């Protein structure tokens, strides 16, 4: 006859799976218990007229999730019925990332990815983060108009206007607050590979990155600028292109200003102090059975820095001597590449030529008349790509190790020689007929 009463919840806040103990009146004969509108098994044992004791099922469907279930616990006796409001805790929010179209304008759409946006209260941006208490900076930009998806995994809203330019988003729920980096210009553009280091003018230049959004500027070693109009950008925002419309005459690096930012390569971009060889003034071929040619623009590598050389003709199978060029080098000063760099961390680099691909033929690179120490049966590749490439020029490059038997350079150095030799042959069972220009041979750290 007496009505049940709940007076408190001993453990408003819980966590799915833990204890809770119901203090009331008359619960001596609860019949039925229930969570957020669902039933909830319990044990008669700890039954009281005074206390319940149960545990919130783990599986328990929560509020966060679905909006129609009363927030509540409900007690059934046989004759009464009690209610007590409680909160069974959703898991906290997290984000993985903003999905946005850079730069980003007040009123522009961005979305919020990640998961557990249950129970959304707030979203703001601020310069700095929030405490760990969820307390929350002294100054904010709040987002007025968001809408949560129905699996509670993303967030689309509007940008507020006086666009913070950097700082952080805060999706702020019930549970706790999430939290993220925020540029409203996004992340600053990355540089991965270069084309070359000395790419030949009047060719193709190519760089690998990302966020290559609205590049704005591409300084080549702070001597000069590609017009914007000569740069070509792909779709995805990681590639970079254009012709090289002069050489340099000093090293440095390339900047790229994007949206998101300017960053430089790493690698030196035409390192003119790292040349050998290049047929126009440093070092010098003396004799052997090649060919020397200065491109036309109609025919051989079509374009060349200066002089470079060929080596082109028929090759009868099983030869063992065909054609070759013997020079002298001139080596890189220890000002520029010390004494005691190892060998392993240098490497030669070239740039080649190959009118088609052949089947056979193998080049030899020698140097300082060490012929134990030198590289053999090499066929040229890019560097940029792994293949052979055909019709252009491309950078070859190779550990210096594979063609010095020295450990550091200046043991290299010691050996007084300054010969290096490119050497063409054919230990194929079939003949072959080859086309290939080489140039700028440099050696370079790794
Ligand atoms: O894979 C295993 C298979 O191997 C097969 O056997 C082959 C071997 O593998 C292969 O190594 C070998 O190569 C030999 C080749 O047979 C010879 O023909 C060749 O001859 C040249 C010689 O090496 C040079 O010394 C020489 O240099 C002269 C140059 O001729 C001259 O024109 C030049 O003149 C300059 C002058 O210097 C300037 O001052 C002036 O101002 O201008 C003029 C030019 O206008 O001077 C050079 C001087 O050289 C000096 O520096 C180097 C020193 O060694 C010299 O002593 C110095 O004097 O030119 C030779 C060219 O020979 C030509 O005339 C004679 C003919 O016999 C020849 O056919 C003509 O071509 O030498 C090669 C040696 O190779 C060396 O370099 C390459 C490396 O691969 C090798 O390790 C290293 O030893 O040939 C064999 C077979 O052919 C097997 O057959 C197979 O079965 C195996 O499976
Ligand atoms: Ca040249």
């Known amino acids: 006859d007496a009505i049940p009463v709940i007076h408190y919840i001993r453990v408003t806040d819980v966590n799915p799976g833990t204890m809770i103990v119901v203090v009331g009146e008359h619960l001596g004969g609860t019949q039925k218990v229930y969570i957020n509108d669902q039933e909830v098994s319990f044990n008669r044992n700890y ?3 005074t206390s319940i004791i149960l545990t919130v099922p783990n599986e328990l469907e929560l509020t966060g999730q679905n909006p129609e279930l009363k927030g509540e616990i409900r007690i059934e006796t046989e004759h009464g019925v009690a209610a007590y409001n409680m909160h069974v805790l959703s898991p906290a929010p997290y984000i993985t990332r903003i999905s946005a179209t850079y730069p980003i304008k007040p009123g522009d759409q961005m979305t919020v990815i990640g998961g557990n946006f249950y129970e959304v209260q707030a979203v703001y941006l ?11 900076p002294v100054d904010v930009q709040e987002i007025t108009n968001y809408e949560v998806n129905n699996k509670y995994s993303q967030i689309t809203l509007t940008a507020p206007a006086n666009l ?10 019930y549970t706790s607050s999430a939290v993220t980096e925020f540029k409203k210009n996004g992340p600053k553009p990355v540089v ?3 084309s070359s280091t000395m790419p030949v003018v009047g060719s193709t230049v190519t760089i690998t990155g990302q966020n290559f959004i609205e590049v704005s500027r591409v300084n080549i070693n702070a001597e000069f600028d590609i017009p914007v109009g000569d740069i070509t950008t792909s779709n995805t925002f990681d590639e970079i292109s254009f012709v090289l419309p002069q050489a340099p005459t000093q090293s440095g690096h390339i900047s790229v200003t994007a949206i998101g930012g300017t960053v430089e390569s790493a690698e030196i971009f035409y390192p003119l102090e790292n040349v050998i060889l290049n047929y126009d003034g440093i070092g010098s071929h003396v ?3 090649c060919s020397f040619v200065v491109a036309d623009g109609s025919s051989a590598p079509y374009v060349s820095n200066g002089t470079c050389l060929g080596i082109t003709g028929t090759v009868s199978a099983s030869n063992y001597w065909w054609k070759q060029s013997y020079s002298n080098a001139q080596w890189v000063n220890t000002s520029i590449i010390p004494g005691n760099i190892p060998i392993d961390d240098l490497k030669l680099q070239f740039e080649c030529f190959v009118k088609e691909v052949f089947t056979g033929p193998v080049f030899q690179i020698a140097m300082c008349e060490n012929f134990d120490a030198a590289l053999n049966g090499y066929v040229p590749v890019s560097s940029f790509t792994g293949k052979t490439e ?3 020029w491309m950078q070859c490059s190779v550990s210096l190790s594979s063609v010095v038997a020295d450990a550091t350079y200046q043991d290299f150095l010691n050996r007084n020689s300054t010969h290096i030799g490119v050497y063409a ?6 003949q072959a007929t080859i086309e290939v220009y ?5 050696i370079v750290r790794k």
């Open 47 to 49: 039954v009281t007229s």
């Open 126 to 136: 601020s310069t700095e983060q929030p405490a760990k208490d969820g307390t929350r």
């Open 164 to 173: 913070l330019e950097e700082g952080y988003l805060v999706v702020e729920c």
């Open 192 to 194: 991965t590979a270069v």
């Open 287 to 289: 004799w052997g059975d």
């Open 390 to 392: 055909t019709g252009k």
């Open 425 to 430: 042959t054919n230990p194929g069972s079939s």
């Open 438 to 442: 080489f140039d700028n041979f440099r």
